[PDB]
Nucleic acid binder design. Sequence first.
DNA 1: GCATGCATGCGCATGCATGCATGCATGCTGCATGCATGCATGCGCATGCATGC
DNA 2: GCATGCATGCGCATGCATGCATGCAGCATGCATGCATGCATGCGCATGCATGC
Lengths: 595, 689
Amino acid sequence: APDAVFGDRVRRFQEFLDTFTSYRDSVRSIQVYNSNNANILPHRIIISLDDLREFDRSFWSGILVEPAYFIPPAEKALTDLADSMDDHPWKLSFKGSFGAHALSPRTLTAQHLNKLVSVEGIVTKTSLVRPKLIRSVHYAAKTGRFHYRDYTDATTTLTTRIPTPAIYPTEDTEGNKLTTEYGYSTFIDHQRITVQEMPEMAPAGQLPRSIDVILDDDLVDKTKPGDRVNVVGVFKSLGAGGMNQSNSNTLIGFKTLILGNTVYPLHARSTGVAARQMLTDFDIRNINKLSKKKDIFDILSQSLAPSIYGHDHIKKAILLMLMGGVEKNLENGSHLRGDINILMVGDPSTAKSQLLRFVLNTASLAIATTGRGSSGVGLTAAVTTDRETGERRLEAGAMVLADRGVVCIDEFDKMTDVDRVAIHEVMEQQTVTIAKAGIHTTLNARCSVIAAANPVFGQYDVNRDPHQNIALPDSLLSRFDLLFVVTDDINEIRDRSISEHVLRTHRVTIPFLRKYVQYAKERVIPQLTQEAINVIVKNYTDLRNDDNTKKSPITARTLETLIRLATAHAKVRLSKTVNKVDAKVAANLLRFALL
Amino acid sequence: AALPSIQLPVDYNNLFNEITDFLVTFKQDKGPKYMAMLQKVANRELNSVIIDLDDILQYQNEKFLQGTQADDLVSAIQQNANHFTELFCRAIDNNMPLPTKEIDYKDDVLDVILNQRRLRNERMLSDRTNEIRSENLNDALREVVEDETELFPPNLTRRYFLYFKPLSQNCARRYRKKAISSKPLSVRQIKGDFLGQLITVRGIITRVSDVKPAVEVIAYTCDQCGYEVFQEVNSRTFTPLSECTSEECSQNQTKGQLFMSTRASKFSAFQECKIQELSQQVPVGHIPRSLNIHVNGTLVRSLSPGDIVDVTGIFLPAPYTGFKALKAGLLTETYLEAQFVRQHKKKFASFSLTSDVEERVMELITSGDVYNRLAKSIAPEIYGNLDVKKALLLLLVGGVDKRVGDGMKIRGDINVCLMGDPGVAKSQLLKAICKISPRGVYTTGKGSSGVGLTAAVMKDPVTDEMILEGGALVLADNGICCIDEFDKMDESDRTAIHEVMEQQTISISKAGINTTLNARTSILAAANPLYGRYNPRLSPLDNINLPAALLSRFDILFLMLDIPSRDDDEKLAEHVTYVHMHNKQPDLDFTPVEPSKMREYIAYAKTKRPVMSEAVNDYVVQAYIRLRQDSKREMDSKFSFGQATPRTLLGIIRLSQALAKLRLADMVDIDDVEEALRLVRVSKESLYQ
DNA sequence: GCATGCATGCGCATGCATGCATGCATGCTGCATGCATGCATGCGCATGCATGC
DNA sequence: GCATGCATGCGCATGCATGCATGCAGCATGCATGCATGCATGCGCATGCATGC
Ligand SMILES: Nc1ncnc2c1ncn2[C@@H]1O[C@H](COP(=O)(O)OP(=O)(O)O)[C@@H](O)[C@H]1O
Ligand SMILES: Nc1ncnc2c1ncn2[C@@H]1O[C@H](COP(=O)(O)OP(=O)(O)O)[C@@H](O)[C@H]1O
Ligand SMILES: [Mg+2]
Ligand SMILES: [Mg+2]
Ligand SMILES: [Zn+2]
């Protein structure tokens, strides 16, 4: 029967929705979209705990400490408003500051039970998404009537209820047989996941702690194993901890878990979740303005790692790799590469690792590897495991995870042949092929590479040809688009200047660079122009038919490199076509790297 | 009250009447189509009925355009497909014509049993009518007869299977509809909202299970009363009956013990297959998922591992089977029940001549220049490389296999090896050939090793028996096996390839396995020189890591070097950069033939078996003698990959046979041997510049 | 170019979660039995009225 | 007015529905075990690769 407290709380939350008028228009917009486009959006909105705090402290504290009594009223109020506005029940999500209620799996204890929490950690294992039967529909042949039944369980409501275990009907009330109508019944999706303490926060040498989270319906496949995640929900207990009946055993306790309602993926370094930033109109105006200047390439280049001295061409190359070219798919099924790769051979104090770590810190999706750090199955995802359902599966590796991203390799020359043959296919065909006992598949590995290497004799030697100084297979070098050699020669003026620079440090910002790169990579796709065609053809012919001794060989890969660099420079320019200047810049950079 | 009632806009009597009208009325643009099908079924020449929804939509539109009313049968079947199977069965059982052929000693046992059952039914009905009339106590008489008499239900008298096939996009687009049943989906996209519908899935088959009998209705017999008892089964397990339940034994005091009789029981042929996502369907940074398909009836053995297909079926639920402690409510598992299969690439064995295929083949032949036209269409985005493309086409067509008697055997398949400098597009040709072939497989070095090739021992989930799962070499049987980075492999894989090229088999003698596999497949390998680029200052056998004999066992061994030349570089750069500006090749005076027509023509050509005359034999022996004399002097100078041997003669014969087959002729000619020798000579021109 | 250590897959022995049945001793609950009580009746006697006389 | 026979109300035994408990014997059930199966683990051997002489 009706309750007075429930109605009072419903009225108070309706007043709350009245004072703040963003959620009303959010609901209107969702309904408008669903009407016009028929894809269907789920019926849900997000509320800010901060606004609730300014509005009504008692209601705020009730939701924080007594969700089982205050949230269903709020959902009913929202549903009533939604049903009143328009010409499924609606659900709620929470954001803002949770104060002392923001915890981790290690610091979540029995004193937080029945309260709304927000946990952070790493996803370790998900489950198979299964349907759950809610309403069945049947048919009787002797009467021509349709019947139905409803089903419920303990996890579909926050408050405890008296069980009503109804049986599955096979007969009629008069004895006639029934027929199931699978198309007219109703099923809902269901999943269960596990969250652990983050590897970068848990104490060292200690076994970790984890907690289970249950999701339903429209939050069923929003994350994958290995992600950094933030889950907000209600920490709840179920059943009887061996209390009903005798149950002499006392070791077990009360089963506990989280009935989740909000899931947020978080970006970190060296992880599979990519960074994205919301772009406002001020940002777009500023970007489209800066696009019109003539030294834009120079400004964007000098911004990369401004604490390092010189290496301007390597900065330009890193920017070009960040932007990238365009990949082509022919109807027959052929694929043409569009990524850019960079290699660096240099002296042992040339700031190679600093630039490498800069790329790791500024790329939206990057993974850091070292020469002997990862090998075998750790790079190509060639490891196999299996579920407790019986099936065997694969799990992603370094380059499989970094699809559509970049990979940083340090101490490149310390690798072996077994993994170099593996990375050949990644660097050219951009695919990984696995053929083990019970598996035959092909995984996409479209990623770019930047690496740093050491000379054979510790320091680069000008008295010998490059082959004795690099000592790497020619077929491997052919797959690197650009190769740079850096040497430190003592010079009084250069040493002085670098000295004042290093002393200055010891006593365009990056976010705008990230926004610029994201917009450029998402919006513009240029096309080839005949002028650039002629320029690149001339340059390729000249390079292929010259007597100069180079740092790397010359093949058709060089021609494709020229096209890729030209297209990436045009992408930087925000132009929809490639001009002569982009081709000339690509040719100049390639010539400088080669000579 | 408990179990309330609900109202739906679905009337089944109307749909039954519509089904009968369609089954008795439809005309194909001769009597009714389905009536002829049913007559053939009655005469015991058909086992399966296929119901096409295009016919239903055409019938509906025909009824509409002339004014009268009609119901939407297509959508009703689509949304609730599992209920209409029995409606169609019942409608069909009401119209089947009498058999016009007598049952003789050369019929199946099932037909004999069904006919006996029908005769017994009629006899019981007549006996009951006679007794009732003799009692002295005609619609009423037949009604009372029907009330008091048992029979054999219709399901125990059927002999056919019924399947549906979806609405094609063409019919819906012409009639202005949205064919939901034939919009391909990945396993990811199939959610719980699609349960109970008829849907189509696109994927690649990974596993198939052996055919076994699945019992539908069990049969028992009672010596006490003489009745036959039937027990329906629709679960994964069942409990056999113990004591008789017939009216006579039920009413008496002493009941009889039932005994199971396998011959009267109803069985079904069952298979279960797994289907996996294609690469292009998987999202960024994810792993592909799978799905389960059930196949029953005459549709079994229509799926083999490694096939990219579009399966049609009804999406249905099943009981939960996970851990008990992780069950929250009434959870279920999903599976697909197969109704129709289509392949993305047709097999050669299933070839058949017909007007449609014959017209296309005749057009291709009339266009003239079949040889070069087919050769130039292989990977048209690659400039040059015409000779290697001709060799690849010949590898696609193959030679003639010879049975000499006394158990001897001569291969007919041709092996080709490409070996050249970096950046010459070997991998592109490997991949294109793998894509053209209907049973092609692609492998690269260390990724596939050990049981990745050959096969391994595992246990079947469905059945409780041990099996062998084939590797790369067994999956491409009667196809092309492409191997990249041929020189970087391990010794065991090299030995396996060695044996496969030798005698089309793989022998394994290890713990728990002692058997011989079938490896009737062709090899297409790629390799690199030992020091990167080729070094013309060293002997040819010192530039490669493979043994000389292994190289000798290839019919064609191509050398591809990269000598800079300011002229040809211009043409290559123009071709590549044009290919990047547009999506097509630059040539305009020549049109490439699409893969389906190439596959059709090769399938037609493969049926030929040209024979060898005597003058061609004289020419062949003379050429062999001359070439063998020449080769020894070259190999003494340490300037030959290998001395000529009888395998060279066998390769010449095979290539001549392949060219003859391409020409669609029953005899060999001198020009074919000329072309074979021309190819085998031009194979090594890179070594004399 | 030849010999040696190392780390990577085959070939297994062995412990342990899950899940189902079975003889038995346990604990509960209907039930036959013991019983008290207050209401209804079967009936005989003492009183007042009706009918001769 | 005087004497008899019948209704009538008072007084005493006795049967019977109600409603409570109590010792006991029967019956369904939780429990100790009895066991099969499928999975993972740790434990060596055969060996292909990298390193030094
Ligand atoms: N060009 C440079 N500009 C500024 N600092 C430099 C430069 N080269 C070297 N350094 C300094 O020297 C150190 C070199 O470290 P690292 O990046 O490991 O060099 P490498 O990898 O070449 O050994 C850095 O800490 C850096 O601060
Ligand atoms: N003759 C050619 N025509 C067109 N493109 C070529 C040609 N040769 C090489 N290429 C290009 O160069 C690249 C060579 O890489 P790949 O296909 O692995 O061959 P390889 O393994 O011989 O280097 C390819 O992406 C291809 O597009
Ligand atoms: Mg460094
Ligand atoms: Mg290659
Ligand atoms: Zn019987």
